[PDB]
């Protein structure tokens, strides 16, 4: 008997729900009390909405309690007979003004420093006798002082955007809140400071030929002397000299950041001109050699969304028609990844035939986000209205799929497929993917989708506005404690914050978001977080408790997009 | 009915208590239940110890509940009829392994950066047309991006040690936990990284002539262009060109850090030789010109404790007898500050006549700490046994004074005197001091004293060991929520964390410790934290909610000393 809630709070003018975890499909009393937390007096009577089993999640039976129409600010909790929820807050831009500072502190806490950053001034390029100066940037995870543009390059369909995404997300934040007087001056300064710190690093990560180094990998040794520019593969981190980052391999996103970084009135250790050049150069180089840098030699959706962003950002900065033309092409290419099949319409396909769907535990939003950046700069109304309808259909999909089974928690669902298994709709990603091993929590994904929904509202019918308000909130709610494990994954907030590997001195950091909750280790249709079986297996326990900078970066853009939307 | 507890936990083999806040002097039933938090079954029956009123603290009536003899690890809470305490933990080195990481993250979060640090490369020296490169170090407070060796130099008896203390505390931490296998290798790396970052800054803060710059002050403007090397006075921060830091003005401590920094196998942006030189040079320069740099031209206790440390650290590093001789002199001088008067024995005197006692809301420990560093290096057994007895008597004092009135909370008491009041024993400092305005929370002071107790045990009888174990714990307990305001002052831990000025974007940072609780604003014998009267007055609300790097630094040394002691 648990009343699961957002451990932080709900928007005054926003969707609000909770979820009841119990034993039965119905109870005697069908009502829940919203109670003022100071006065302990009831302030609303709430109807329970029955549901029960969810996929095959062990914990028990789950039900929904909506209290959206309630719009009076303050602190409340839910009560149900004996049991009552944790206190939460209803206010305007609650998440933003509560967490934003701490998330940014996290980033500043995880800046590459000391021994490691000294060494990163003279880093071996694998297989050569060359060095590069690639100091700066952020350590990637609670237990990894390696620094990434991307990894899992070898699986092809999995490449997550890492250090670049951080930078671009931050710049994109500054963008939406420039002119917003409710965003404090010091708070704007802090976001520039961090963003430009990142930009500098991205600029340093570009080899003179025009490509960007993909990884600075230490094989998880925490050895200074093992820090090498490379790629790697498998869970044993076999290093390889394919360190050229293609569009999907984090290069596309690195261009987009540096182009946006160029538009700031201030700059970092490098000038605005320095950034823009590195962007333009880096783009036309990949326009030539992308395919040579792709492990399977075929561009997929990830390349398409990444490159579109790069072009959209370069046009904005330079106003040079070439880039609008390139955007237009990439957009048309991306719109082609919109596929319908015999059991679901307008899903995103990785492959061009529609045989393997797109699904991502990190950047799942970007398809729609990237199209929205295009729509923002596309003045020809034929092109606009075409790709407008793509964005509309893709959002209709996200809603359709997520509401096609019993889903009290509102957890965004997705179309997945394993290397050797059938296309199926799912809560979590296919564990049996091309990596051979890789799967973890999706907090990044959730916040990515949340961000997508908020940023798309400009280009969407007001028919589908309110539904996405809910979808996006339900995603965020999960991250901060409206989940079966009654666990806030944002550290230093809510309850039951998970740590990673304290006994080895690899702690989580306050303000960071951890990987999060996954499908069952043994049972794809169950749910798992640090399950007893594998909780102590250091080969597996990374999947849940460990923090990873994309989770934070997407959370940061989500809360800012949310703040802007109210 | 509140059962106040440590919001984190108690040592398995450590003193444990709670405090009952209620209405009455006695209750009907006189017993409290220690309850297992997982099984909800009783595990001990605890006697209440009656007390009632404390000084003139408004909240109500206070009683003690001791449960020290209970030594079974796990999670428990106290229950008393309907009401129960917050869950807490009993384990070995509980505070250290719970917080250490986060406190260090805080420091890395508060490193001087961005536009501010760029500007700190070319800082005007007030009244001249000179520049100094003083980039690095940590921002001083939640709402101050100025960087300090010390301030309140003008009041003479108030100078707190700031940036140097951080560095020295950290180095001193590394020292006690070198060889300690329970301190993770990565965790040692992080502490060096941060310490050496600090050392570099202290090295940069030394003008070539041999003195150190006292402050890098921006008049709280958060303006880049207002950053000037200077001193200042009053609450309006009137800048002045007396920027030479004497022994008490943070110079003594800066020497001590750089000397200890020289002993590390690794080094920062400057070499071990660079640090040692800056130390030796800086010392012999102050040995000459100290008096010229003191606002009132007279050395007081603060100079004596600061300089002793410097000498003790320089002897350890160089093994050059000159410094042991200097230590020996400073020690003899400091022992002279031990005074008895007609109502209290072996208090610390600021002035040489004993007319104004020493009391400090920051570094109150150092007298005894500095003598202990001397005792650590003093081989002549006459000198040792003399100053041994001083350290013994000074601790007997701290215990005597703190147990002379109804004191359920165990809050270390102190001998104070104002500009406008008689010598009196007190909980908090004299608000009516030489600053003209300055008084705040004493969390630094508490942790300073805790640290003192742990580090002194080597040189103390086992007769007075257990009492100081309790005193030190009772200090720490207060910081993390065993206080009338049921408030953990360590951010990201316990309950009711206070923020500072979020509406202006001057947030507290997770891992930091804030100023804390004070005497009543209107009533010296009451207690205050963000009281309604002054809570919104921005001229006064700094006194409570604001974070300040000494609180953190002393907390960090306390938890480390504690960890070492069990």
Author numbering:
A (entry chain A), B (entry chain D): 1 to 566
How does the study describe this entry?
Based on sequence homology, VC0615 was assigned to glycoside hydrolase family 9 (GH9) of the Carbohydrate-Active enZymes (CAZy) classification scheme, a family primarily associated with endoglucanases (‘cellulases’). In 2008, a large-scale assessment of chitin-utilization pathways in the Vibrionaceae suggested that VC0615 was in fact a exo-acting glucosaminidase, the substrate of which was the GlcN-GlcN-O6-P disaccharide resulting from the import of chitobiose (GlcN)2 through a phosphotransferase-transport system. In contrast, a substantial amount of starting material remained in the cellobiose digest after 1 h (both reactions were initiated with 10 mg ml−1 substrate). These experiments demonstrate that VC0615 is a substantially more effective exo-glucos­aminidase than exo-glucosidase, which is in line with previous observations on PBPRA0520 and the lack of cellulose metabolism shown by Vibrionaceae in general. VC0615 forms part of an exo-acting glucosidase/glucos­aminidase subgroup within the CAZy GH9 family, alongside previously reported structures of PRPBA0520 and VP2484.
Here, we report the structure solution of the V. cholerae enzyme VC0615, which was solved at 3.17 Å resolution with poor-quality data reflecting crystal lattice disorder. The best molecular-replacement solution from Phaser indicated the correct space group to be P3221, with five molecules of VC0615 in the asymmetric unit. The VC0615 crystal structure contains two relatively well ordered homodimers of VC0615 in each asymmetric unit (chains A and D and chains B and C in our structure), as well as a fifth highly disordered molecule of VC0615 (chain E) which appears to lack a dimeric partner. Difficulty in packing molecules of ‘chain F’ within the VC0615 crystal lattice provides a clear explanation for the high degree of disorder observed in molecules of chain E, and may also be a substantial contributing factor to the poor diffraction quality of VC0615 crystals in general. Calculated interface areas were 1294.9 Å2 per molecule for the A–D dimer and 1289.6 Å2 per molecule for the B–C dimer. Given the essentially identical calculated interface areas between the A–D and B–C dimers, as well as their strong similarity (r.m.s.d. of 0.32 Å over 1129 residues as calculated by SSM superposition in CCP4mg), this arrangement of VC0615 is likely to be the biologically relevant dimer present in solution. VC0615 protomers are comprised of two domains: an N-terminal fibronectin type III (Fn3) domain (amino acids 1–92) and a C-terminal (α/α)6-barrel domain (93–566) which contains the active site.
